[PDB]
């Protein structure tokens, strides 16, 4: 299948309380596989999926030193950004980093990503050409000129075309079925009378992977878009996801309603009813 790897960094300043907190998480598709927290008793990269545990001690040692260095770099970036924006040295600010690679079924790079947000606003991003930057404002143009002079885009491109693609391929070979084969939803319909005249039909999708899914209610095979309550897809906590869709219907008309489930893990789209 097509796959992605992403690293997500969050640095949060706390002036007067010490160095910023740095947290990193790594994902392959929708599976978190590593974390690092600068505030841990002994900070180090830690496994968060079983298939990464087989990586040897040199892996964990290299990555731990990288996060420690990146925490110090983000601390410098936070100091520079509050200077660029002429902000108070007393206040807490956020620097977020998001990078990684999208690959096709043959494992070739489809797209590289390397971008940043300051206090929840887009700041600077490596363009799809992996050679040029988009800066949000004159502060980000200071960073852009610094990074153009330092040939940062070249160093980012080398990672995204090399280590990112090559390590994602390795994780997929080690992850095997956990990463390659979708886990279809377990589905059921529940019925909740509101009154003698109205009832709720709720269509459940549980334990599915990956998170992408479509749930629709139909009346006589027509989508009930404007009348469906749909909850945001949510983690079960065991690496699988949940979703439900609900419709309020006239009591005794339940038989006209079908729930339609589309998920990559299903042999074919499911039609469910209250039964």
């Amino acid at each position: 299948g097509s796959h992605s790897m992403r690293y997500f960094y969050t640095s949060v300043s706390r002036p007067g309380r010490g160095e910023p907190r740095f947290i990193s998480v790594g994902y392959v598709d929708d599976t978190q596989f590593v974390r690092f927290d600068s505030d841990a008793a002994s900070p180090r990269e830690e496994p968060r999926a079983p298939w990464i545990e087989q990586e040897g001690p040199e892996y964990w040692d290299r990555n731990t030193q990288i996060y420690k260095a990146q925490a110090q770099t983000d601390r410098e970036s936070l100091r520079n950004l509050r200077g660029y924006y002429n902000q108070s040295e007393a206040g807490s600010h956020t620097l977020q980093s998001m990078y990684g690679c999208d690959v096709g079924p043959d494992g070739r790079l489809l797209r590289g990503h390397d971008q940043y947000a300051y206090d929840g606003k887009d700041y600077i991003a490596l363009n799809e050409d992996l050679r040029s930057w988009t800066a949000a404002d004159t502060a980000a143009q200071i960073t852009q000129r610094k990074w153009e002079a330092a040939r940062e885009a070249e160093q980012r491109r080398a990672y995204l075309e090399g280590e990112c693609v090559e390590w994602l391929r390795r994780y997929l070979e080690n992850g095997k079925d956990k990463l390659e084969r979708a886990d279809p939803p377990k589905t059921h319909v529940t019925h909740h009378p509101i009154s003698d005249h109205e009832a709720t039909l709720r269509c459940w999708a549980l334990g599915f992977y990956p998170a992408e899914i479509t749930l629709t209610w139909q009346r006589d095979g027509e989508d009930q878009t404007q009348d469906t309550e749909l909850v945001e897809t949510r983690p079960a906590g065991d690496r699988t996801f949940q979703k439900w869709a609900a419709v309020v219907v006239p009591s005794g008309e339940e038989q006209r309603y079908t729930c339609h489930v589309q998920h990559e893990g299903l042999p074919k789209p499911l039609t469910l009813r209250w039964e």
């Binding site: 290299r62 410098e76 600077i124 610094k146 330092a150 980012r156 280590e163």
Partner: peptide, 9 residues
Amino acid sequence: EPRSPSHSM
């Protein structure tokens, strides 16, 4: 595996 850090902003 993560990218080696490079220059500050």
